[PDB]
Design a protein around this ligand. Structure first.
Ligand SMILES: CN(CCOc1ccc(C[C@@H]2SC(=O)NC2=O)cc1)c1ccccn1
Lengths: 14, 251
């Protein structure tokens, strides 16, 4: 998925 | 409904002021001398002001890393955005953030140079053009964009809505749920149109001109990724991790 390829962007969004 | 479109515009402006410490209003005051930045115009002054082309490239990267985090905070204040699927939030930011970075960079530019370090420095355009190939052409497309964009005389309240429209683009590759994005964007577009009619009543077809700038920004980012592929094959330095993630499979 997209989520799995973007650890850091996910962290910032969370 | 018009009053609601104004409340949306105001919410976005207030959000923008919370997210972005160096606004266009503040940058223009520094640039026209109404508030002094340290001027970097050659190698000697770059030393005074704190391999040169690579140091400058790395400085631009660290600024982008900061900007991504500011932009992400701002995106999370756009009504509807945090309720999107997380995959779609990430795709919107991945494909949008450089377009916003270059939009906001224009706020810190004149025809002769760019503010750095939150307005504590000013780096001349000529100095950047003097860097060894291919780094001498890194910034020149961005200055070219900025001179044309700044001629539209947008303010921070206009930019807040323009940036939101760009982030909520339903044509990014790999979006899972386009319809909610397009519905948010359509309302943002109506809010942008009303903002420009009210704030720039004398500026005919400003809205259409801004829609075209959104296309132009995509070309800027495409050209930048082309320059990066040149740099990566001619040099042997790598990107900050957050930039690696954004650029990986970025068209
Ligand atoms: C010329 N300035 C101003 C900032 O200018 C910028 C130019 C390009 C970017 C995008 C970065 S650079 C890259 O390849 N990818 C990115 O995300 C971001 C900022 C600076 C700023 C700090 C130090 C040296 N000079």
């Amino acid at each position: 998925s997209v989520x799995v390829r973007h650890x850091l962007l996910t962290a910032i969004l969370x | 409904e018009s009053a609601d479109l104004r409340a949306l515009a105001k919410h976005l402006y207030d959000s923008y002021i919370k997210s972005f410490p160096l606004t266009k209003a503040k940058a223009r005051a520094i640039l026209t001398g109404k508030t002094s930045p340290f001027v970097i115009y050659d190698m000697n002054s770059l030393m005074m002001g704190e391999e040169v082309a690579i140091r400058i490239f790395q400085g631009c990267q660290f600024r982008s890393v900061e900007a991504v985090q500011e932009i992400t905070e701002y995106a999370k204040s756009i009504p509807g955005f945090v309720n999107l699927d997380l995959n779609d939030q990430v795709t919107l930011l991945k494909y949008g953030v450089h377009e916003i970075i270059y939009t906001m960079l224009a706020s810190l530019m004149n025809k002769d140079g760019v503010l750095i370090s939150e307005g504590q420095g000013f780096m001349t355009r000529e100095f950047l053009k003097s860097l060894r190939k291919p780094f001498g052409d890194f910034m020149e497309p961005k200055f070219e964009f900025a001179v044309k964009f700044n001629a539209l005389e947008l303010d921070d309240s206009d930019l807040a809505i323009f940036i939101a429209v760009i982030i909520l683009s339903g044509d990014r590759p790999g979006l899972l749920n386009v319809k909610p994005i397009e519905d948010i964007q359509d309302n943002l577009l109506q809010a942008l149109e009303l903002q420009l009619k009210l704030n720039h009543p004398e500026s005919s077809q400003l809205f259409a001109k801004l829609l075209q700038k959104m296309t132009d920004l995509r070309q800027i980012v495409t050209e930048h990724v082309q320059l990066l592929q040149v740099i990566k094959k001619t040099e042997t330095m790598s990107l900050h991790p957050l930039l690696q993630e954004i650029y990986k499979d970025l068209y």
